């Protein structure tokens, strides 16, 4: 898609190794925020947007937090607390012919900056100051998309890169998608280590009266730390207690 | 260099309707706006109006609003024009020209060339009985 | 839309300098203010000659200069010669954001 009205594609109810990506060498430009790339195997998400889209390849740059800029002011932007990933690769081979390819097209005025992900997919003509325009395009009201282009001959700073960010939230259950792990079976009233599609840490876990509400797939104590949980392979509630300690 | 090549001489007998190309190369298409303009022989060469290859649509005068179209063709990198009549007056040589454009600049965008820097050979249409 | 005020021919001039007056109505020349002149040689297309109100495109000689505003405007020539004549058409920018056009004036170098 044209980074005006960016393709937004929702990953869910799935396994995959992220891996498979960036060990292959076609991906000139990765980097994640909030979470290690070589980990991100390891953890589980409560939902994932892939956020697609072309733009030209020295405006790369602007797709990450914080920073701004006439593609991140107009077209899409990224919040502060930002968690996720970028990705971003030479397309001159494909988006990209002779004649220039200008089915691909970018807002270059707008009213005022977009919230984090806004999608904006309006036409309207930009008024600078006018009186009602009409609708006509003219002295100070202008058309606000203008297209790139991307002859092959052009400057390769110039020359369109394809862009993926993958956006996810790491919050614990319920988690539509993992990492792949295969999986033991469980283990109550003695002492062990666990993980929860995440969740990790220890204690002895026991059969609950704790009555979970049907939709309530995490549960935490007056202490704030995670105090009962519900098996993702089986529903049973589990109630966690630390194991045995003290001073000697 | 930047060109522009309007397609051949064609005819038309009165009354009906007829249209014209003009490819442009060398170039940057989404560039600039298209204007054409005509006259007929020793008239006043003063014909006017425009298409956007950014976004369609279109302008032309008060006395064509709805005698004329704009068409364009992108990945063509061509735009056409059409008169829907084929009035005896209409004859000889139709031009399509670069024009309006922007030029975004620092920190500032905003439209810029207001002058149609560039001709096309234009065609002849011919057009009378 | 109505035509661009413009003279006939130049004369007065058989080389040296003389001026075309371009007298638009103020929703074209009063307004935007962004005059031009073409020149419109024997068949071919017309060229630039003058880009905004007072000013020269690349490849044009130092001897044209457009001009003026509060009355509306005009293009001076200088060191008119043999190969230079031709008829020169004023156009303009008008409120309603299509340009208008002038009758055109004919060079008469002797």
């Known amino acids: 898609a044209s980074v005006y009205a960016w393709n937004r594609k929702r990953i869910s109810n799935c396994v995959a190794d992220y891996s498979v990506l960036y060990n292959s060498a076609s991906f000139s430009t990765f980097k994640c925020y909030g979470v290690s790339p070589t980990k991100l195997n390891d953890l589980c998400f409560t939902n994932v947007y892939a956020d697609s889209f072309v733009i030209r390849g020295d405006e790369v740059r602007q797709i990450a937090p914080g920073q701004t800029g006439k593609i991140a002011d107009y077209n899409y932007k990224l919040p502060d607390d930002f968690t996720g990933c970028v990705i971003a690769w030479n397309s001159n081979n494909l988006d990209s012919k002779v004649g220039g390819n200008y089915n691909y097209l970018y807002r270059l005025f707008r009213k005022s900056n977009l919230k984090p992900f806004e999608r904006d997919i309006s036409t309207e003509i930009y008024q600078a100051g006018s009186t009602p325009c009409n609708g006509v395009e003219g002295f100070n009201c202008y058309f606000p998309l203008q297209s790139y282009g991307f002859q092959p001959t052009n400057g390769v700073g110039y020359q369109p890169y394809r862009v993926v960010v993958l956006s996810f939230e790491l919050l614990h259950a319920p988690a539509t998608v993992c990492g792949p792990k295969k999986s033991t079976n469980l283990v109550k009233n003695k002492c062990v280590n666990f993980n929860f599609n995440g969740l990790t840490g220890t204690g002895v876990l026991t059969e609950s009266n704790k009555k979970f509400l049907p939709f309530q797939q995490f549960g935490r104590d007056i202490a704030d730390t995670t105090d009962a949980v519900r098996d993702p392979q089986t529903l049973e509630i589990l109630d966690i207690t630390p194991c045995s300690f003290g001073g000697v | 260099q930047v060109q522009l090549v309007q397609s051949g001489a064609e005819v038309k007998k009165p009354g009906a309707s007829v249209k014209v190309s003009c490819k442009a190369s060398?170039?940057?298409?989404?560039?600039?706006?298209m204007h054409w303009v005509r006259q007929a022989p020793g008239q006043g060469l003063e014909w006017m109006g425009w298409?956007?290859?950014?976004?369609?649509?279109?302008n032309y005068a008060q006395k064509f609003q709805g005698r004329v179209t704009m068409t364009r063709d992108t990945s063509i990198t061509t735009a056409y024009m059409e008169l829907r009549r084929l009035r005896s007056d209409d004859t000889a040589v139709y031009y399509c020209?670069?024009?309006?454009?922007?030029?975004?600049?620092?920190?500032?965008?905003?439209?810029?060339?207001?002058?149609?820097?560039?001709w096309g050979k234009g065609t002849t249409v011919t057009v009378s009985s | 839309q109505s035509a661009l005020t413009q003279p006939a021919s130049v004369s007065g001039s058989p080389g040296q300098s003389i001026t075309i007056s371009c007298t638009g109505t103020s929703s074209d020349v009063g307004g935007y203010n962004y005059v031009s002149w073409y020149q419109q040689h024997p068949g071919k297309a017309p060229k630039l000659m003058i880009y905004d109100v007072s000013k020269r495109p690349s490849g044009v000689s130092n001897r044209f200069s457009g001009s003026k505003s509060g009355n509306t405007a005009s293009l001076t020539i200088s060191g008119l010669q043999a190969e230079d004549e031709g008829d020169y058409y004023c156009?303009?920018?008008?409120?309603?954001?299509?340009?208008?056009f002038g009758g055109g004036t004919k060079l008469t170098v002797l």
């Open positions: 060398g170039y940057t298409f989404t560039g600039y706006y």
């Open positions: 298409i956007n290859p950014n976004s369609g649509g279109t």
């Open positions: 156009s303009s920018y008008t409120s309603s954001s299509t340009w208008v």
């Open positions: 020209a670069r024009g309006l454009g922007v030029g975004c600049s620092g920190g500032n965008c905003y439209l810029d060339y207001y002058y149609m820097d560039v």
